Write a protein that binds this ligand. Structure first.
Ligand SMILES: N[C@@H](CCC(=O)O)C(=O)O
Length: 245
C-alpha cells in the first residue's frame, strides 16, 4: 500500500532556499523522505490547505518552521490550528519543527511566546531526558546524552501542555523536544537546516540591522568547525513519522 505524507509549509521560500534547493518542499523531502513515498505540500502560510476529507489518506504530517509567531491570530494560523486539532483527534502522526512544535503546543492548551532567555541563531546542543526514552525506540538502541541541532527562533513554549512529555532541554529553554501520546513529536530546532541556510539567514538579518555584527559573528562561529547531528536527526524523525521503531 502506498505511503503518503503531507507537509504544511508555514513559510514561503527564501531566495537562497529557492535558488539552492528549489524550495522548502525539496528541503523537507530531502531530510525526511525515502524512495517511493508520495509527498504533498500545502503552503499553509498562503492559506492553502488539504481538503478535510483527504486527511485519512496520509500516513503522517510535518509542520515546518515559520517567520510568523505561533501565538498570532491570522486566519491561516487559526485554520492550521483547527486542522491540527482534527488530525490530532484522528491519532495521525504529526512532526512539528520549530513553529510546528509551537503550534502543536498551542492546540493542546499550551502557551507560546517570546523566550524568557532571548532568541537563538546558532548551532547548539540539547540534553536528552533519557528516563523518557525506550532503548530501541525512535531514538536508537543507544540514546546519546546530547544532540547538536541548528537553532533559529525567538519564541518558545512558555507553558507546556500537561499531556506532553519533555524529551530534551537546554540550559536556556526548558522544552527543546517533547511528545504527546504516540502520535505527536515536536522539536524546537531545525533538523532540516544546514550551515548554508543558517549562514544565509544570519547575513540577511545582520544586513537588515536586526542583530549586531558581533552577534552574527558569534552565530557563525558555532558552525565553523562542527555541524548538527543530521544523520541522527533523520533517523529519529523518520522512525517517528513512519512508525519504523
Ligand atoms: N517565529 C517562531 C518560529 C521560528 C521558526 O519556525 O523558524 C520563533 O521565532 O520562535
Amino acid at each position: 500500500e502506498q505511503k503518503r505524507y503531507a507537509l504544511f509549509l508555514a513559510t514561503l521560500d527564501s531566495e537562497f532556499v529557492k535558488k539552492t534547493y528549489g524550495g522548502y518542499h525539496n528541503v523537507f523531502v530531502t531530510t525526511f523522505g525515502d524512495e517511493g513515498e508520495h509527498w504533498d505540500s500545502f503552503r499553509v502560510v498562503s492559506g492553502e490547505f488539504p481538503d478535510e476529507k483527504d486527511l485519512e489518506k496520509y500516513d503522517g504530517f510535518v509542520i515546518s518552521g515559520s517567520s510568523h509567531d505561533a501565538f498570532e491570530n491570522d486566519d491561516w494560523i487559526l485554520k492550521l490550528c483547527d486542522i491540527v486539532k482534527k488530525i490530532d483527534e484522528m491519532k495521525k502522526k504529526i512532526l512539528g519543527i520549530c513553529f510546528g512544535h509551537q503550534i502543536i503546543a498551542r492546540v493542546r492548551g499550551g502557551t507560546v511566546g517570546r523566550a524568557k532567555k532571548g532568541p537563538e541563531l546558532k548551532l547548539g546542543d540539547i540534553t536528552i531526558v533519557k528516563d523518557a526514552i525506550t532503548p530501541g525506540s525512535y531514538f536508537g538502541n543507544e540514546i546519546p546524552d546530547s544532540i547538536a541541532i541548528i537553532k533559529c527562533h525567538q519564541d518558545e513554549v512558555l507553558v507546556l501542555p500537561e499531556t506532553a512529555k519533555v524529551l530534551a532541554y537546554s540550559k536556556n529553554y526548558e522544552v527543546e523536544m517533547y511528545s504527546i501520546e504516540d502520535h505527536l513529536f515536536c522539536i524546537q530546532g531545525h533538523p532540516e537546516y544546514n550551515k548554508e541556510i543558517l549562514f544565509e539567514i544570519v547575513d540577511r538579518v545582520l544586513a537588515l540591522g536586526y542583530v549586531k555584527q558581533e552577534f552574527a559573528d558569534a552565530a557563525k562561529a558555532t558552525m565553523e568547525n562542527r555541524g548538527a547531528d543530521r544523520k541522527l536527526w533523520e533517523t529519529i524523525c523518520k522512525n517517528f513519522l513512519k512508525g519504523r521503531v
